[PDB]
Design a protein around this nucleic acid. Structure first.
Ligand code: NA
Length: 319
DNA sequence: CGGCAGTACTG
DNA sequence: CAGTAC
DNA sequence: GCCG
């Protein structure tokens, strides 16, 4: 359960991160998968041929693994553009991605203070910038509990039947959480409809929601802060789903993102697709001309079973 | 080589 | 539509 | 980046 390849994964991560901020999204993904594969390997990798037998690791990656193995270093790291750390700075701003980080850099911006004054910001980015440090800190698991509970108590005041579950890294049992995701549904047919808009206004007037980032029909991305002195602003999502979708949503929003991805790819090998909504039979084509059949999945286990896969609890889904 | 998810909001 | 994030 |  321990990473026997740490000195190697560290160097790789620096390189992946650089590709990521530069917007080389797919090469960065390739790196991420190789890195997870290395973290879970039963022992320190000791040969180029052993590295190649690992799924997610190919010639080029093995090459870099062995260089670090035998050198201690990765020459490539020495040739990353000086731009990278500023690109990373700017793209740590919620709502700012690689294109915006890049644009700002091309304009000569170099610090958050520059961005704050001299730069043009979307409404989302401004909320991101002003909560920049708060949003970078992981919060104690117990603060995730308070936040989730604040939502649940305000939710159940409208309909005591509503189920609220905190997902993401919280559900996966982490001691600290980067954000909170509160999934809400109702066991009955569908008493989840109608109360969303009212819950948010309640939480807002109450003082809990400080800023809105995205107001969707059934998904809310925003910012909360618990009552009291010295509280930090925390990133918060609320999703409302019909009961039929509870299992898939629970799975998706629990993630992790890497796990979700691997689950989609498996589903694909079995002629299926997996989304936050459903495990479904393949779609009708030409192109793309109709939905697949939805496969009933009351529980997460159902989803794993239908993919011919043993159930893995939330704590075992880092990837 | 192409796919690596599909969508949902904001502007 | 481009960009961003779930 | 990797994989079929
Ligand atoms: Na960001």
């Amino acid at each position: 359960a321990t990473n026997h390849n740490l000195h190697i994964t560290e160097k790789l991560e620096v390189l992946a991160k650089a590709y990521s901020v530069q917007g080389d999204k797919w090469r960065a993904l390739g790196y991420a998968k190789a890195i997870n594969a290395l973290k879970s390997f039963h022992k320190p990798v000791t040969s180029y041929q052993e590295a190649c037998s690992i799924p997610g690791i190919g010639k080029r990656m093995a090459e870099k693994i062995i260089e670090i193995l035998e050198s201690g270093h990765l020459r490539k790291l020495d040739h990353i553009s000086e731009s990278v750390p500023v690109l990373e700075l700017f793209s740590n701003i919620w709502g700012a991605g690689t294109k915006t980080a890049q644009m700002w850099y091309q304009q000569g911006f170099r610090s958050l203070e520059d961005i704050r004054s001299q730069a043009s910001l979307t409404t989302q980015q401004a909320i991101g910038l002003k909560h920049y440090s708060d949003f970078l800190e992981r919060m104690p698991r117990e603060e995730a509990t308070e936040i989730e509970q604040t939502v649940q108590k305000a939710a159940q005041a409208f309909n005591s039947g509503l189920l609220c579950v905190a997902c993401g890294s919280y559900r996966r049992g982490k001691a600290t959480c980067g954000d909170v995701d509160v999934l809400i549904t109702h066991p009955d047919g569908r008493s989840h409809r109608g109360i969303f808009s009212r819950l948010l206004d309640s939480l807002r007037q109450e003082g809990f929601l400080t800023d809105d980032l995205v107001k969707g029909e059934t998904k809310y991305l925003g910012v909360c802060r618990l009552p009291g002195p010295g509280r930090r602003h925390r990133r918060l999502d609320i999703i409302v789903v019909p009961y039929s979708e509870f299992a898939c949503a629970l799975l998706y929003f629990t993630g992790s993102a890497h796990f979700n991805r691997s689950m989609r790819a498996l589903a694909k090998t079995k002629g299926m697709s997996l989304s936050e909504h459903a495990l479904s039979t393949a779609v009708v084509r030409n192109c793309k001309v109709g939905p697949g059949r939805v496969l009933p999945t009351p529980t997460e286990k159902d989803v794993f079973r239908l993919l011919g896969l043993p159930y893995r609890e939330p704590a075992e889904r880092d990837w």
